[PDB]
Design a protein around this ligand. Structure first.
Ligand SMILES: *[C@@H]1O[C@H](CO)[C@@H](O[C@@H]2O[C@H](CO)[C@@H](O)[C@H](O)[C@H]2NC(C)=O)[C@H](O)[C@H]1NC(C)=O
Lengths: 48, 46
């Protein structure tokens, strides 16, 4: 649970770069596939 | 035989069409997981 985003999966260190107001990223077909950790502010991919 | 190679190197629409059709259907299947059909939300956790 990332401040509201509830899900399941493996979390992994990312190498994408959000814009500094975007929280999570979505795929085509609209599924959450990246998040940003609120405390440390790093992007993490979400694989099933 | 040397001209087939130019005309292709420079036409496979019947093969492209069946790929496109299948992808367009698989995307429509997933995009339906976000409709209510007359419910309060689209999420079972809601
Ligand atoms: C939220 O609070 C934590 C501590 O409660 C902050 O963690 C600190 O991060 C800095 C990095 O700039 C470290 O130098 C400190 O030692 C950390 N403190 C602790 C207690 O670990 C965290 O930075 C805060 N969130 C934000 C966005 O700043």
């Amino acid at each position: 649970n990332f401040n509201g985003l509830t899900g399941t999966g493996v979390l992994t260190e990312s190498n994408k770069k959000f814009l500094p107001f975007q929280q999570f990223g979505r795929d085509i077909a609209d599924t959450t596939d990246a998040v940003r950790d609120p405390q440390t502010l790093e992007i993490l991919d979400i694989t099933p | 035989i040397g001209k087939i190679q130019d005309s292709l190197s420079s036409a496979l629409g019947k093969l492209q069409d069946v790929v496109n059709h299948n992808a367009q259907a698989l995307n429509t299947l997933v995009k339906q997981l976000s409709s209510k059909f007359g419910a309060i939300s689209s999420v079972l956790n809601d």
